[PDB]
């Protein structure tokens, strides 16, 4: 257990800033898309 | 039929589902529960048991009555907000607008409910002579204070209206020419669930008279 | 010196409002508190 | 009057005795070739008349007295 | 609410010994907490969905919103 | 006096960090349930119940200052990077009207670009970006910033300064802190906040006037671009530069010392109102401004008694002896106690303190429209609408504060052994007149102000428009107020009670409409910062309205401060504290008895209170005093048009929209509400779709708010229970038991909730109207 | 082509709505300088927009009269990238974060480890549950809990 980290809102808010910056990337990454393309 | 009926339909789905976790929520807990086991020596409608244990409020079978009230009346606003939408784009030629609007909410508040008020809120004005719609313009507004003034009732609960009705007691027993004029019934507060009730019958008045005067006013307004 | 109070258990207090000898004359001869007077005439001079 | 044109001439609720009208209310609710200020009909009561088979005042008054007469006789 | 009147009033857990109704009283956090679930679902998803499409169309762009037809009930 | 201080209470550590809920004792216990956690939360600041040693107290009081004048500075130093990186402020200082300021662009990333506005679009910035309204550019070209690097290195110093009040909160709090007795001496805190802090700080603003702004000013309205002097016009060396911008004096700060102050009569001038070039005060005006308050301020910091080893020094006023001296015979003895209640009790003195930096900020509201300060600025109309919203919203908050903090004094900090027959006391042996009186006049005020709303909304349906409270109708006139703006407008000239004005307080008091140049496309002059403000029906309705809200707000909190201890209902309600949620279903029901749930209503009629107020001011400035002068004989076209009033007898009279529509409800539903609303709700697909995404947003937090606001906590409870039985019937079990929230906390998330969504919804509106016209 | 839908290919209306863009991103392009962070930018929404409206084409996605992709929900493989695809990719991921968070449950229970988290013990929590039906489909084959 590390200081001042493993607390709940400072795991939790980096968690939630960690999803929503690789889901930003993988929206960059498969440039926004809407659906899956299967052709 | 399209997706913004497949939207709303499940806006609608949402409304009675919810409508109904809230009953069959307090049908079944209304004999016992674990924050209150011998609930139904306590009757129907009763305020609390008071603030321990956490605190009671809205404990009671009628007030999940009460508050499915609420989620009942959003949910019936949902189901003729759709109607009354989807009818009034047939009816003006202009069903793109429905199927292009119908799926996100400006367009429920806008292309719907800023753009079918018009003649509605001109039923009567400074500068226009009044018409036929002047009535329903005058229940809209009616029915805006009359659903907020159950917004007192709902929020602002009772020992404040006990204390300041004691002042106002006070008031009467030592203003002369008015103290050898004496009430009967001692003036209280209403009761706590007469409060809840009280805020719900102005809150229902209000929505009904509301929509009732928007939906005539609005389709009557056409032309 | 203003403000007494006579009977301090009883919620009220004794104020040059209240206790001023000429609004004691106006307020205790005002027609519902004028002594002498049957109720009717009382009514009839509040009335008129 | 609504049956000689059903399609323009809108059906009529009740007539209004409103002392607090001023002179625009009264023109307002007053129709074209009306004596007076009205409720215009959003019940559908007149459509329901028509196709239960009403085409005279005369059968909606014997109507009003039918139905006094039965509560009369449930009460 | 006469049913919820009926249950603190007028039922009695005797006379119905294991019927039906006294089931439905001995799982009902599982009616409760389904009904619950059904809420959440259908509250998530559609005001999500709905939320998504203001999103794009404040953004510029009509042809990214979300959009289903019905197929269930157009069959 | 002499500073006592003592050495090192707390050795600085990290232990405390993982052990969260250290300060109280329930909470050292550990998590049990989740109301801890909102426990953890509501405890934090409340350094009462933490210790119960009062000089502990006021340590932790004092780092706290420290610790939030360094936020405030993080705060400050972000906006200054924000005008330092990515800002258009070098050609906005070249075009202030034609040009809208700009500090902020959206990266090219999910499509949020539209938002990203071509009206911002010049050199440097040549994105587009999101259009401010806190007027920061005005500011900044007020004071004399012109370049983008010396805002980098007061962005780079409000940094440093962050630093420095950290420091010194962590130094004054575990290093080397004060005793109780340095607290106590306000006499000295009172001297040296005057003389010092208010007193040398206007002081050296108008040395800054003086020195940088007024030339720098002048060198921008005289017509040269940004190319700048900003170090050769300064100090002793290029004193003569002091001569070449306007004359300075004859030589030097030698006819300061001399006493012949009239040939400074240049630079510190008394000429009056507003300027027609710029629209905004003199900056001479300002100067001279800021130098007699300065010293009136030095003056008011010499006043209370300090004892101390200066010899001679020590004669003035002790403010016991001041306050023991006012005693009256209607006020017994008058202010005896009042000088130990505010050198024991902090919230007493946070009461009166919220009060007056509430009322402040209101008055600040007020007089930043009524004269402009900054150059160029109440033609930026979303910047007028914004500060003088945003400063009534401060307001009403510090004020809801004030009533707060006196009512947690009553519970907490009143002693009956000081306050005996003092102003205090008495006025809690009468408090049934005071409230029952201001219940009376509340009354009073909403029947005759609303009902003549609702009359008017009657008469107009009715076909009535003669019967209307109105300016064609039954007349109210506000001859007092009209008095007072004739007795202002009137007071410059020769002859009058101020005989040596050029021009006036503020032209809003009934002298001439002025405008100024600006582009707007490709257009004339056209732009009225500001016009004259008549009064008429409309205003003697809403400024009852007003009244009235300000007087339901104060009979909530007041009655909230006065039966905080006991009532006749509950004699021990200080045994049960300041925040409780009830006393039980008994004595007819108890719910929000407590003196916190008189603040959590005062909040909404606070909302009340600043909502109707910003909606006189959006609708008064929009209709009367904002607008356009035409090309053809430069007549005056408001933001709304005029409204031709029918009359009831065939014609028509010509009034503005606020004195036409906003006589009734009806006008304000659909004239104001319906009407202005149309750019918020079709702002989607360009730059102001976001504050259509805030303006529904904000309509989803204040209808989730009722949620909590008409429910309570027992349905959620057994509801809860249902959710916890389908958690263990899958081995999903938190050791942190699942809680609903607890009647004052589902109160207080109630009121935020419905504070957030209904301001961000009025604020949406505003600004998503006022960028379009 | 189903009801109320026909597919991109033969939408004359996405037609309309693809040129509307591509035609006003072209003279935004066309009035500005382009060496200065704006044009590049639009360029690249230039590019990104002609492979966006290039891959609704050749998808099926579908749109008929308002020219906008409409999805169809049946479980269909021809749409199966509408609901399937990301239907899969959801209870991965969201039985990845419940596997995990319940995991961290049975494995701490204690009051201290949910507000100050283990990541010793939250982290290979999180790598089970990058792998949770291997773990959680025979404990619903096995039962969890005898509770009324
Ligand atoms: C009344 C209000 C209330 C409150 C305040 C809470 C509060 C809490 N609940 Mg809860 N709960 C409630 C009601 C409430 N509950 C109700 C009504 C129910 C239904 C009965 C539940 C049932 C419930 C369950 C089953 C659980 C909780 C848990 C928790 C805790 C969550 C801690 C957290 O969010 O950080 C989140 C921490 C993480 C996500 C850790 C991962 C972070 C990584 C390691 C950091 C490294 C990532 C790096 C930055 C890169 C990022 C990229 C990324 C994609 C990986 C928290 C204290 C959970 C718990 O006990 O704590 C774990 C838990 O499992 N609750
Ligand atoms: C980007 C799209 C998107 C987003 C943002 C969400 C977001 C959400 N979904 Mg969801 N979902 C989506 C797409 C999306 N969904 C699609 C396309 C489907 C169709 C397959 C679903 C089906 C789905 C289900 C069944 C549920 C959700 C639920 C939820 C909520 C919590 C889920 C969570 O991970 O918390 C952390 C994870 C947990 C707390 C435990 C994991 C539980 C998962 C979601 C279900 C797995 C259980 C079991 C194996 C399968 C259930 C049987 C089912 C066929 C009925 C959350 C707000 C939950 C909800 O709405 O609450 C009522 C929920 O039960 N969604
Ligand atoms: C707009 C206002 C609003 C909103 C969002 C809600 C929302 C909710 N109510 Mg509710 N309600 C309201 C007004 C509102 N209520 C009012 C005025 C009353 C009368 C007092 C009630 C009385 C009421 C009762 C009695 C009950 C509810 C329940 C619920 C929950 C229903 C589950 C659901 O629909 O789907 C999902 C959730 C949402 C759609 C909420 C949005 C959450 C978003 C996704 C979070 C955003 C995250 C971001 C980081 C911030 C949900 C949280 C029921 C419940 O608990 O169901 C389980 C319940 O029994 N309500
Ligand atoms: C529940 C309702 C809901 C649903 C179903 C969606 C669905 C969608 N949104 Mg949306 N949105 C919503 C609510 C919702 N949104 C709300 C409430 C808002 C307001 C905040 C938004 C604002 C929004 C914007 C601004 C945009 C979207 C976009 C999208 C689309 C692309 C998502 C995607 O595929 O990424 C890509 C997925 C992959 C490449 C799959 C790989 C996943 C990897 C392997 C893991 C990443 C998952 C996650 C981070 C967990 C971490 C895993 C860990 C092991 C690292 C998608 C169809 C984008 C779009 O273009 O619309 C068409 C977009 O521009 N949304
Ligand atoms: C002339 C000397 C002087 C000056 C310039 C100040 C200045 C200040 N004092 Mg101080 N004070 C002084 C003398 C002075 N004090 C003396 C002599 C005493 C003891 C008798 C105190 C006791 C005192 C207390 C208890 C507090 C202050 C606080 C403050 C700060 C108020 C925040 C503000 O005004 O906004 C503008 C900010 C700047 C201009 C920088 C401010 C910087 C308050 C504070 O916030 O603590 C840090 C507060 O807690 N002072
Ligand atoms: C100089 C200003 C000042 C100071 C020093 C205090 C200090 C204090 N107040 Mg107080 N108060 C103030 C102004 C001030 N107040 C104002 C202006 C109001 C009117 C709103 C109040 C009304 C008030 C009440 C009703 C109470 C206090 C209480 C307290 C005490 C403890 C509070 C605490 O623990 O922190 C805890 C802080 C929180 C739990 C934060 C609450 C959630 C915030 C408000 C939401 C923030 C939203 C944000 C602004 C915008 C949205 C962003 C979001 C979307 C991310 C503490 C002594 C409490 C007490 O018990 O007194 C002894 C209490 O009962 N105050
Ligand atoms: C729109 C809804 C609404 C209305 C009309 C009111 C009205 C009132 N509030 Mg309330 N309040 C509200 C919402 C509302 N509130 C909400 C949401 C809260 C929760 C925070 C509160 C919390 C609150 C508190 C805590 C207090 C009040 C007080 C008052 C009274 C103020 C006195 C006054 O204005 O004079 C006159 C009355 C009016 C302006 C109401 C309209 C009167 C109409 C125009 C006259 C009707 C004519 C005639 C009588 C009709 C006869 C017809 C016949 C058939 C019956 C007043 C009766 C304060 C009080 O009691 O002080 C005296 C008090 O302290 N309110
Ligand atoms: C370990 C986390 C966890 C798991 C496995 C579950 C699982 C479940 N929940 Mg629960 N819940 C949780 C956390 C969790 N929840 C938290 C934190 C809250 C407070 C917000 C709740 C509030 C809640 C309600 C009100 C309900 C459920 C319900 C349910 C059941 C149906 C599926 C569903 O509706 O998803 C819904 C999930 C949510 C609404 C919560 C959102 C997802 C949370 C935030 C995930 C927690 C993340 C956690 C911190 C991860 C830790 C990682 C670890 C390695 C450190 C299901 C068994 C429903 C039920 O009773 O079904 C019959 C029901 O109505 N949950
Ligand atoms: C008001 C004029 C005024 O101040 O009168 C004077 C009187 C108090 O004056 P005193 O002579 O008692 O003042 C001495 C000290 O208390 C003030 O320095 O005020 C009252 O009567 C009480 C206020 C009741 C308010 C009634 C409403
Ligand atoms: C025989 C008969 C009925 C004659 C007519 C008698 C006559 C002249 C007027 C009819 C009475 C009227 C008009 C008002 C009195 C009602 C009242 C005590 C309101 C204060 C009050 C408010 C505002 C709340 O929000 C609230 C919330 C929750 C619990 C309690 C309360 C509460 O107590
Ligand atoms: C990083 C981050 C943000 C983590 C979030 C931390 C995590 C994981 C969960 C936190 C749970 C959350 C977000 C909320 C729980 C609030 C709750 C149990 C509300 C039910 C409830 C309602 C709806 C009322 O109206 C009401 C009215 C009057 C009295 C009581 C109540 C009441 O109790």
Partial sequence: ?39 | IGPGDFLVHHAIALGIHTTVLILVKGALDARGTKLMPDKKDFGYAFPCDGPGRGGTCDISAWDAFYLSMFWMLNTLGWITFYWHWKHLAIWTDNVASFNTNSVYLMGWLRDYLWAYSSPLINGYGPSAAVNNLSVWSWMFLFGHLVWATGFMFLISWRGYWQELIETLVWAHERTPLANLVRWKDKPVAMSIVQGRLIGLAHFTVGYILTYAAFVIASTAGLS | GMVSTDDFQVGTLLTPVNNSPFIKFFINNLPINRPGLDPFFRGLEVGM | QWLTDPTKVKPIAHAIFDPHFGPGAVKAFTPEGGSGPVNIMYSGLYYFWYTIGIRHNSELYEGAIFLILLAALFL | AHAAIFWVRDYDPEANKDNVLARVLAHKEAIISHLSWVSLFLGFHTLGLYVHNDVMQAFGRPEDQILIEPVFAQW | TRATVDNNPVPTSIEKWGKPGWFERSLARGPKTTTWIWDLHALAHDFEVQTSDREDIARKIFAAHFGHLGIVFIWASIFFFYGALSSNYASWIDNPTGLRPSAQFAIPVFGQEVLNDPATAAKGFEQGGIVMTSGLFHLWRAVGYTNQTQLLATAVGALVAAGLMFFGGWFHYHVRAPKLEWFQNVESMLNHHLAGLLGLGSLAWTGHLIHVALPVNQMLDKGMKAADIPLPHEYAFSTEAMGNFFPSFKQGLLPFFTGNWAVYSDFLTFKGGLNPQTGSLWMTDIAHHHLAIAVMFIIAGHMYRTNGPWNPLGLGHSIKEILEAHKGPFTGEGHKGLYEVLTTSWHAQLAINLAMVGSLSIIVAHHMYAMNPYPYMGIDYPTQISLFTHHMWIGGFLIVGAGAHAAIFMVRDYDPAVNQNNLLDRVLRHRDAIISHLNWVCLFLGFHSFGLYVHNDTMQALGRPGDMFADWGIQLQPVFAQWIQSVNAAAFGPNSTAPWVSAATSPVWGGNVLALPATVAGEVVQKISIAPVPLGTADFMIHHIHALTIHVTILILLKGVLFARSSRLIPDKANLGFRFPCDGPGRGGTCQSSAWDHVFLGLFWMYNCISIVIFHFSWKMQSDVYGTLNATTKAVEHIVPSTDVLLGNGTTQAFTQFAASSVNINGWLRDFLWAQAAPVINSYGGPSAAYGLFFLGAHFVWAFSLMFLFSGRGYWQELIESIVWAHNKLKIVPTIQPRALSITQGRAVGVAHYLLGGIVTTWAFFIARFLAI | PLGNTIPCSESQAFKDLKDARINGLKEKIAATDPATQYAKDLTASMELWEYRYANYEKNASCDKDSGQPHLIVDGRLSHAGDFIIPSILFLWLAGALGWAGRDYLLKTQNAMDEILIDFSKAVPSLVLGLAWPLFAIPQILSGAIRDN
């Avoid at chain 1, 590390?2 to 960059?28: E, H």
């Fill in chain 1, 1 to 39: 257990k590390i200081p001042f980290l493993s607390l709940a809102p400072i795991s939790g808010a980096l968690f939630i800033i960690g999803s929503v910056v690789v889901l930003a990337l993988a929206n960059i990454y498969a440039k926004y898309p809407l659906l899956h393309p299967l052709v």
